[PDB]
Write an enzyme that holds these catalytic residues in place. Sequence first.
Site, PDB file in Angstrom:
ATOM      1  N   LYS A  75    -108.256  -4.119  33.547  1.00  0.00           N
ATOM      2  CA  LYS A  75    -107.899  -5.058  32.492  1.00  0.00           C
ATOM      3  C   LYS A  75    -108.903  -6.189  32.333  1.00  0.00           C
ATOM      4  CE  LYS A  75    -104.246  -5.344  34.917  1.00  0.00           C
ATOM      5  NZ  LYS A  75    -104.954  -4.727  36.066  1.00  0.00           N
ATOM      6  N   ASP A 131    -108.525 -15.379  35.168  1.00  0.00           N
ATOM      7  CA  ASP A 131    -108.560 -14.064  35.788  1.00  0.00           C
ATOM      8  C   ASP A 131    -107.678 -14.048  37.027  1.00  0.00           C
ATOM      9  OD1 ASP A 131    -110.085 -11.362  35.707  1.00  0.00           O
ATOM     10  OD2 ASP A 131    -110.278 -12.001  37.798  1.00  0.00           O
ATOM     11  N   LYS A 156    -100.676 -26.381  26.778  1.00  0.00           N
ATOM     12  CA  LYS A 156    -100.196 -26.899  25.472  1.00  0.00           C
ATOM     13  C   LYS A 156    -100.871 -28.225  25.133  1.00  0.00           C
ATOM     14  CE  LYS A 156     -96.464 -26.372  27.473  1.00  0.00           C
ATOM     15  NZ  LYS A 156     -95.149 -26.265  28.144  1.00  0.00           N
ATOM     16  N   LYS A 181    -110.219   2.896  37.440  1.00  0.00           N
ATOM     17  CA  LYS A 181    -111.007   2.374  38.548  1.00  0.00           C
ATOM     18  C   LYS A 181    -110.761   3.171  39.818  1.00  0.00           C
ATOM     19  CE  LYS A 181    -112.015  -1.979  40.933  1.00  0.00           C
ATOM     20  NZ  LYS A 181    -111.384  -3.133  41.627  1.00  0.00           N
TER      21      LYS A 181
HETATM   22  N1  LIG Z   1    -112.152   2.344  29.359  1.00  0.00           N
HETATM   23  C1  LIG Z   1    -112.324   1.500  30.368  1.00  0.00           C
HETATM   24  N2  LIG Z   1    -111.534   0.409  30.438  1.00  0.00           N
HETATM   25  C2  LIG Z   1    -111.709  -0.438  31.456  1.00  0.00           C
HETATM   26  N3  LIG Z   1    -112.572  -0.377  32.463  1.00  0.00           N
HETATM   27  C3  LIG Z   1    -113.337   0.717  32.364  1.00  0.00           C
HETATM   28  C4  LIG Z   1    -113.281   1.674  31.382  1.00  0.00           C
HETATM   29  N4  LIG Z   1    -114.236   2.652  31.621  1.00  0.00           N
HETATM   30  C5  LIG Z   1    -114.830   2.275  32.728  1.00  0.00           C
HETATM   31  N5  LIG Z   1    -114.336   1.104  33.210  1.00  0.00           N
HETATM   32  C6  LIG Z   1    -114.742   0.413  34.410  1.00  0.00           C
HETATM   33  O1  LIG Z   1    -113.656   0.445  35.301  1.00  0.00           O
HETATM   34  C7  LIG Z   1    -113.663  -0.747  36.124  1.00  0.00           C
HETATM   35  C8  LIG Z   1    -112.356  -1.476  35.948  1.00  0.00           C
HETATM   36  O2  LIG Z   1    -112.194  -2.407  37.042  1.00  0.00           O
HETATM   37  P1  LIG Z   1    -111.537  -3.834  36.789  1.00  0.00           P
HETATM   38  O3  LIG Z   1    -112.055  -4.805  37.788  1.00  0.00           O
HETATM   39  O4  LIG Z   1    -111.659  -4.174  35.351  1.00  0.00           O
HETATM   40  O5  LIG Z   1    -110.014  -3.538  37.122  1.00  0.00           O
HETATM   41  P2  LIG Z   1    -108.869  -4.590  37.449  1.00  0.00           P
HETATM   42  O6  LIG Z   1    -107.615  -4.132  36.831  1.00  0.00           O
HETATM   43  O7  LIG Z   1    -109.400  -5.938  37.153  1.00  0.00           O
HETATM   44  O8  LIG Z   1    -108.698  -4.427  39.025  1.00  0.00           O
HETATM   45  P3  LIG Z   1    -107.539  -4.986  39.968  1.00  0.00           P
HETATM   46  O9  LIG Z   1    -106.311  -4.820  39.144  1.00  0.00           O
HETATM   47  O10 LIG Z   1    -107.530  -4.155  41.208  1.00  0.00           O
HETATM   48  O11 LIG Z   1    -107.875  -6.414  40.232  1.00  0.00           O
HETATM   49  C9  LIG Z   1    -114.915  -1.508  35.689  1.00  0.00           C
HETATM   50  O12 LIG Z   1    -116.045  -1.065  36.417  1.00  0.00           O
HETATM   51  C10 LIG Z   1    -115.050  -1.063  34.240  1.00  0.00           C
HETATM   52  O13 LIG Z   1    -116.346  -1.277  33.739  1.00  0.00           O
END
Ligand SMILES: Nc1ncnc2c1ncn2[C@@H]1O[C@H](COP(=O)(O)OP(=O)(O)OP(=O)(O)O)[C@@H](O)[C@H]1O
EC number: 3.6.4.6
Lengths: 43, 520, 529, 93
Positions: free
Chosen positions: C338, C392, C420, C497
Amino acid sequence: GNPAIFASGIIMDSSISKQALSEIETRHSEIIKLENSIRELHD
Amino acid sequence: KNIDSNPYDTDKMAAEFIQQFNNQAFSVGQQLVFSFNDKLFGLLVKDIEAMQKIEVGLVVGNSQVAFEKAENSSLNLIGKAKTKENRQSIINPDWNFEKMGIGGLDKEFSDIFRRAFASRVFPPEIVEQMGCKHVKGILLYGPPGCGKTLLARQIGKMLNAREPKVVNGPEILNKYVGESEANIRKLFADAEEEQRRLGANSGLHIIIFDEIDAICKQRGSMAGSTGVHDTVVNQLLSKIDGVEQLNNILVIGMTNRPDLIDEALLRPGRLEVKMEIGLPDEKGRLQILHIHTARMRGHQLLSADVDIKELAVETKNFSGAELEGLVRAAQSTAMNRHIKASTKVEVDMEKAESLQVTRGDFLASLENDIKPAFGTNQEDYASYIMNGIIKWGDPVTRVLDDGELLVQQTKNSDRTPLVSVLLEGPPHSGKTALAAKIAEESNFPFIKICSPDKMIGFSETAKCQAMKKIFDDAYKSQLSCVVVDDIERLLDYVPIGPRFSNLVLQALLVLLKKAPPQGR
Amino acid sequence: DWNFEKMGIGGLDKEFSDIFRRAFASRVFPPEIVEQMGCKHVKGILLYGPPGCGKTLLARQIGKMLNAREPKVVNGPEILNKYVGESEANIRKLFADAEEEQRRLGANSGLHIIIFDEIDAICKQRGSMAGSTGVHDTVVNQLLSKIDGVEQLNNILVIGMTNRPDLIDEALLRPGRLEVKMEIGLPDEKGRLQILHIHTARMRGHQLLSADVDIKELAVETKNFSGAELEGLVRAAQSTAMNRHIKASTKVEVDMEKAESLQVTRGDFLASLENDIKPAFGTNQEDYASYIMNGIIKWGDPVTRVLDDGELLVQQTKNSDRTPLVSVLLEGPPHSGKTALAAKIAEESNFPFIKICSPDKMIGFSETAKCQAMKKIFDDAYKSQLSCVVVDDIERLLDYVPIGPRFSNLVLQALLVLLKKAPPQGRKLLIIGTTSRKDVLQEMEMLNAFSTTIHVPNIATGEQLLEALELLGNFKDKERTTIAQQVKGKKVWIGIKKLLMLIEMSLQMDPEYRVRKFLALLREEGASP
Amino acid sequence: KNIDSNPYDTDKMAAEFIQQFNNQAFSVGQQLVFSFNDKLFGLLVKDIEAMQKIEVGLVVGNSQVAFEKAENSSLNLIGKAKTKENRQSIINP
Ligand SMILES: Nc1ncnc2c1ncn2[C@@H]1O[C@H](COP(=O)(O)OP(=O)(O)OP(=O)(O)O)[C@@H](O)[C@H]1O
Ligand SMILES: Nc1ncnc2c1ncn2[C@@H]1O[C@H](COP(=O)(O)OP(=O)(O)OP(=O)(O)O)[C@@H](O)[C@H]1O
Ligand SMILES: Nc1ncnc2c1ncn2[C@@H]1O[C@H](COP(=O)(O)OP(=O)(O)OP(=O)(O)O)[C@@H](O)[C@H]1O
Ligand SMILES: Nc1ncnc2c1ncn2[C@@H]1O[C@H](COP(=O)(O)OP(=O)(O)OP(=O)(O)O)[C@@H](O)[C@H]1O
């Protein structure tokens, strides 16, 4: 630690003195007499 | 006796020369005396050209004369008729890169030279048509013992300028009000005076701050010394770039913590060339070893067995200072091998002539004397593996094979720069030994163990900072491997309650998914 | 002989017009009418703003603009001394000439200027509490008494510059002493164009500048550059060519045959942009590359939907007038990727100011430090016309843990208050926030603050998984067919991921075992929708 | 006035002296002026040995010259064409 501290007042001290100046007069006076004498000799 | 620095207009004195010496014969190399505004000058004929080169010619009304000041002459000529102004170069004629004695920093030196000295060596006339000021600062940072002070010293003795002032740490602080600022202001006085006097012709000046982070801190952050430090920072900021302009200075600073320095002091128009000095790679080690072992090769004191390439290969993650210390210890060993005096110092001569540093000295010194700060340590494995490993069943082999697979993945992958794994089992099963046998066979250039028994009695923040320091150190190598053991002991868990340290848990959770800088 | 273009200041027309109107208007009108109006003269100016926007330049130019004496300059704390009562004699010395000339020549005297640099170093607020007396309050009292006291002066002008307008003593700013206050801020596009022309006129004069260099493109391409940074850019661009014509690795030499075709080309500008100059209120591609590590792939419909909903929000915040502050929450299960989507949306926003607040840069901080850091980051966003900010992993920011539960109350209150607060009038802000446990936030009464919510799903069908594999291209035709037969008749529950990591783990086996291990791992992971 | 601490290569200046004053008479205690690299030095003849000590001799192309700085002189002489030597006894029996 301690913030920067100001300095204290100053106390100067004059050197020359009245009686020491009488002594300097003693020094000076004889010179004029000696001068009269030498002027006499040259003349 | 009558030498003066006052300017002389070449146009007026050239017109006077034409007036006085019209219709007169002049030959190349002719020496004469010219009187201009009651001032006597020695003139020597250098070249003649017909309106073709001619040894002797006749000066006429429309003859043209170009004057150039003699070598090492303080005469100040101003005008356009003159062609050679004899602008003394800002670099000693003797200098050349090789004699500097620095290896493994070619790119950084190239950048510094391009961005700081390029405009002080191009012909002045072209520069004046662009109307551009000169850069005013450089900043250097990196881990200890990588060659910052050396670079500063070499740059300082590069230039044809006067001797550079030096500030050794916080040697400007004082207890009485308004004394530190006076010490700061005293530094720039000579530059200000020379600027006012000479304008565009002034020579260069250099100031070197050492451990600058001990003085310049962010304003409003510290407590208990805010007044003094704020005053110092304000004074420095005002002096470097104030209402009155200076154009003949250069300030060099060096520090180990580039984050504590104020932000307003690092904008263009101030210290604006930031460089990072890091550990060298193979070529750098080879160059440094070549530099530090030149004289002995010249005098034939170096045995024929030593192969520098092998030594370059075998020393990984070394820094310059350590590469120097290795050679020094190797030499000391050989020197002591001939001297033999325990009772009373007593040197010999028979074998004090055939002194020869051999491979054995290098190896022995390498295995006993030097201990790199970023390298691998062997005593740790001796302590944590006290009775070896016994093959009593298949599970041991299974575990070791899995560890090998993980190691290979982390070394060959590109989409997964970071990996993790957890070892667990019932008590008294020997997890720590297996972990420290999977780290040792890793064959990585950097290994470390973070155990609770080095933090007895610490408070939460201390543990957090210790772990952060270890990981920061690990972030400066092309490979790494870190072992964290007995997590529950780190967290101070106790079933009653339950009770535990939240701060450490949060720090660990954050650190477990932070990628290193690019490519590592 | 004064003229405006000679000043050489660009992008500050309105401020200079106001200063001229308020300060110098009455010293140029015919004296008789001014006497008939019976008005005094303004005797102060204060300038404040962020570093490197052109204060000292303006002060110096004003100093040069007047047919008067030579200004007296004070460099920060240049008056402090250690002996009792000297740091006030130094102050009193400055006004002696003005006083004497007034006494002698009545109402025909000249004009005396005084310039204080970094005034906030010696003019902080007076403690006004017994036992908390400041280290030096006599200086402030002396200055206040001198500027406007029992005796009257009418021939002075005081100028002050500072970076922190909040620490100056309040009695020093009433309309009698320092009446005209000005804020010098970042310029807009036209100001950047003017500054570039000002700094490039000379080069263009002597045909030293190439033909392919167009200023307008550069002006458009540099967003939120302070004044000094454009000058630095030009300086580096110049230095590059001069280096091109200097060979120095053994002995410095300057080839003087090809040094008469010196010309600056755009490539130098592009390289300098890429490497040398880095702004402070702008953005750079390193951050996004750090967060979007493996790009974005269209593995199914939902992706598009998500992005579309972002675009709409952005558009609103740009054109709405009633709602100058909007916010949204992205949520979903773990390892759904996300944060990457939030980064992508922010990057596509095209706003001038983009910043990302992440826990990665606050390890070990006490809660107070976290509060201050967040406050500073937000404050920096109130000084632009358009801003976007990303929060984040909210749960990590609060230090949450199921047992107890246990969290930080102070940071939660800070956030709740800070969602707000509308910005200064006439500016627009967007906030995006990511999380992975909606229910907890629901209990804390936090979903009320946000304006809407968006859902990020997992992969849930064999077709989506096969498409993802094909896009990544790790497994070839025969292996893909085998995997299809194995999986096409079931349902799946996995995050992208996690899928990447599974593929990487699988690839390490021998060429003829990879498929089986991959399938075993996929089976073992477990669905538990 | 022109005193300086810069090093002087005794070999080069000895060779120049031989070149300039070859086939010339020199006596013990003789005082003269020598120009080396546009620098003027006062030279005093201290000892002469036949190619035995002799009061006066003839300097030839292959004559050997050993230079020693005058007492309290700041002249910096380098090279092996000098009698002065240094050795520190930093240890004792
Ligand atoms: N369609 C996609 N959407 C999102 N991320 C993608 C996609 N394709 C590849 N990726 C890659 O997948 C990874 C997603 O990891 P990310 O850190 O965004 O997950 P997260 O939800 O923040 O992790 P966590 O929930 O464990 O903290 C990144 O390397 C991103 O570039
Ligand atoms: N690049 C190099 N090539 C050759 N020798 C080097 C190099 N860098 C350092 N050295 C050697 O190692 C020494 C390191 O000392 P130096 O003062 O340069 O380190 P430093 O960075 O100042 O250390 P610190 O910053 O921790 O005080 C030098 O004196 C020199 O002997
Ligand atoms: N095959 C083996 N596997 C593991 N340990 C072995 C093996 N053979 C011998 N040992 C020894 O068994 C001991 C195991 O102790 P170790 O400290 O590793 O256990 P531990 O799990 O950390 O203990 P605890 O759970 O009490 O903290 C070590 O001395 C280790 O060298
Ligand atoms: N509007 C502008 N037009 C042209 N040049 C500008 C402008 N603003 C800034 N500059 C450039 O910035 C340079 C330095 O700016 P200045 O001296 O004003 O810094 P400052 O704002 O006083 O910084 P600080 O806040 O640190 O005091 C000037 O010499 C000029 O080249």
